[PDB]
């Protein structure tokens, strides 16, 4: 899990939205009559109505991530 | 899981939306009468109504990720 | 889990939203009659109505992260 | 979990929102009749109505993080 | 958990919001008839109505963090 | 948990909000008929209506933090 | 838990808010019929209506912190 980013050196934009009665769910764990319920999150959960990402990483970016589940 | 990004050196845009009564679900784990329920997330969950990504990674970007599930 | 970012050297923008009656859920763990319920978060949970990220990481950025679940 | 950021050297912007009756939930752990309920958070939980991040990390930024859950 | 940031050397902006009847929840642990309930927080919980972060880390920033849960 | 920040050397801005009837909750631990309830906080809990952070860390900043929960 | 900050050397701004009927809660531990209830805080709990932080850490800043919970 190695993430390397390097950068070496020597206009009109628009996002529009008009939403009425919007119900948004991201990561959902709905259950009834269990004994175990595990929600392990190690990435990136981006929820919303206007989830907008613009002009990200203009230079060098490294988003190294890891997760695990061990049960014995 | 090695991610390498390198960059070496020596207009009109629009997204529009008009939504009424929008129901959006991302990662959903709906269950009844279980004993185990695991939701392991290690990537990227992007939910919304207008999930817009514009002009991302102008330079160098590395999004190395890993996940695992071990049960014994 | 190594994240390296390096940067070496020698316009009109808009996001708009008009939302009425918006219900947004991020990471949800809804359950009934369990015995264990674990929510381990180690990434990035970004919720909202206008979850906007603009011109992030102009230079060097490293977002190294890790998480784990061990049960014996 | 090593995060390194380095930077070596020798316009009009807008986010707008008009929200009525907005209910936003971030990380939620709703349960009934359990015995254990653990919410371990080690990342970044950003909730709101207008969760806006603009021009972050103009120089060098390192957001190294880690978390764990051990049960025996 | 090592976070290193280094920086070596030799416009119009706007966020607007108009919210009526806004209910925002961050990290919530709602439960009934349990015996244990642990909320361990070691990251960054940013809640609000206008959770705005602008031009953060102009120089060098290191946000190294760690957390753990051990039960035997 | 080592956080190092170093910096070596030899415009119009606005955030606006107009909120009516805003209820904001941060870290909440609501429970009924338990025996243990622990809320260990070691990060940064920023709640409000206009939670605004602007031009933070102009120089060198290190926000090293750690927390733990041990139960035997 | 080592935090080092070093700095070596040889415009118009605005935040506005107009809030009516605002109820803000930070870290809350609401419970009924328990036997133990511990609230250990070692980070930074910033609550308010206009929780504003501007131009913090112009030089060198180190915010090293730690906390723990041991029960046997």
Q: How many CB pairs under 8 A join A and B?
A: 284
CB F72 within 8 A of CB G51: no
Structure token digits, residue E43: 């990251």
Structure token digits, residue C9: 């050297």
Residue A1 has a CB neighbour count (10 Å cut-off) of: 17
Please spell the DSSP secondary structure of C14-36, one letter per residue: -EEEEEEEEEEEEEEEE-SS-S-
Q: Nearest 5°: CA angle at G26, between G22 and G29?
A: 120
The minimal CB distance from D15 to the residues C28, C50, C66 is found for: C50
- Entry resolution in angstroms? 3.2
Which residues pair with residue G8 across a beta bridge? F8
Q: How many Å apart are CA E61 and CA F5, to the nearest integer? A: 6
What residue in A sits closest to B33 (Cα-Cα)?
Answer: A33
CB F25 within 8 A of CB E24: yes
Pairing of strands A2-8, B2-8: parallel
Residue G14 has a CB neighbour count (10 Å cut-off) of: 12
Q: How far is CA E58 from the centre of its chain?
A: 19
Q: Residue count of chain F, please give it.
A: 72
Q: Which of D34, D6, D57 is nearest to A4 (CA)?
A: D6
Q: Residue count of chain C, please give it.
A: 72
Q: How many Å apart are CA C68 and CA C62, to the nearest integer? A: 20
Contacts of E47 (CB under 8 A, 6+ apart): D26, D45, D47, D48, E24, E25, E26, F24, F25, F26, F46, F47, F48, F51
Structure token digits, residue C51: 């979850």
Q: Which residues 14-53 of chain C have a CB within 8 Å of chain A?
A: 14-53
3-state secondary structure chain F: CEEEEEEECCCCCCECCEEEEEEEEEEEEECCCCCCCEEEECCCEECCCCCEEECCCCCEEECCEECCEEEC
CB A2 within 8 A of CB A63: no
* Tokens 């940013």, located at residue: E46
Structure token digits, residue B50: 């207008």
CB D62 within 8 A of CB E6: no
Q: Nearest 5°: CA angle at E17, between E11 and E21?
A: 170
Structure token digits, residue G49: 């209506």
Q: Which of B63, F69, E8 is nearest to A2 (CA)?
A: B63
* Tokens 């806006």, located at residue: D52
- Is D25 annotated in a binding site? The answer is yes
CB A55 within 8 A of CB B58: yes
CB D38 within 8 A of CB E69: yes
Residues D13-37, buried b or exposed e (16+ Cβ, 10 A)?
A: bbbbbbbbbbbbbbbbbbbbebbbb
Enumerate helices (H) and strands (E) in chain B, giving the number of each: 0, 8
* Tokens 């070093």, located at residue: G6
Q: Fill in the DSSP letter of residue A11.
A: -
Enumerate helices (H) and strands (E) in chain A, giving the number of each: 0, 8
Pairing of strands A45-46, C45-46: parallel
Q: How many Å apart are CA D67 and CA C65, to the nearest integer? A: 8
CB E25 within 8 A of CB G28: no
Q: Which of G48, E42, E50, E67 is nearest to F46 (CA)?
A: G48
CB D65 within 8 A of CB F44: no
Assess B68–C contact: CB distance below 8 Å, yes or no.
Answer: no
Q: Nearest 5°: CA angle at F27, between F21 and F28?
A: 80
Structure token digits, residue G62: 């180190």
Contact E48 G43 (CB under 8 A): no
Experimental method: cryo-EM
Q: How many Å apart are CA G3 and CA E12, to the nearest integer? A: 35
Q: How many Å apart are CA G1 and CA G21, to the nearest integer? A: 41
Residues E18-33, buried b or exposed e (16+ Cβ, 10 A)?
A: bbbbbbbbbbbbbbbe
Q: How far is CA G67 from the centre of its chain?
A: 14
Q: How many Å apart are CA B63 and CA C61, to the nearest integer? A: 12
The minimal CB distance from E33 to the residues F33, F53, F54 is found for: F33
Burial class for D11, CB neighbours closer than 10 Å (0-12, 13-18, 19+): exposed
Residue E58 zone, left/alpha/beta (φ > 0; ψ -120 to 50; rest): alpha
Q: Which of D70, C29, E30, C70 is nearest to F69 (CA)?
A: D70
Q: Which of C1, C2, C4, C5 to mutate to test the interface with D (most CBs of D within 10 A)?
A: C5
Q: To the nearest whole angstrom, how far is the Cα of C30 from the nearest Cα of chain D?
A: 5
Q: Which of C38, C65, C44 is nearest to C56 (CA)?
A: C44
Sign for the CA dihedral angle at E5, C53, A63, G1 comes to positive
What residue in A sits closest to D11 (Cα-Cα)?
Answer: A11
Q: How far is CA E5 from the centre of its chain?
A: 20
Q: Which of F51, F20, B45, E19 is nearest to A48 (CA)?
A: B45
Q: Residue count of chain B, please give it.
A: 72
Structure token digits, residue C28: 């949800």
Q: In what order do the strands lie in the sheet with F38-41?
A: B38-41, A38-41, C38-41, D38-41, E38-41, F38-41, G38-41
Residue G9's Cβ-side half-sphere holds a number of Cα atoms within 13 Å equal to 5
Contacts of C67 (CB under 8 A, 6+ apart): A40, A41, A42, A66, A67, A68, C40, C41, C42, C43, D42, D66, D67, D68
Phi–psi pair at D59, nearest 5 degrees: -110, -110
Q: How many Å apart are CA D29 and CA D38, to the nearest integer? A: 9
């Amino acid at each position: 899990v190695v993430a390397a980013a390097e950068k070496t050196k020597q206009g009109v934009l628009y996002v529009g939205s008009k939403t009425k009665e919007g119900v948004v769910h991201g990561v959902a764990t709905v259950a009834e009559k269990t004994k175990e319920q595990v929600t392990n999150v190690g990435g990136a959960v981006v929820t919303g109505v206007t989830a907008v990402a613009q002009k990200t990483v203009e230079g060098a970016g490294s988003i190294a991530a890891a997760t695990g589940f061990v049960k014995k």
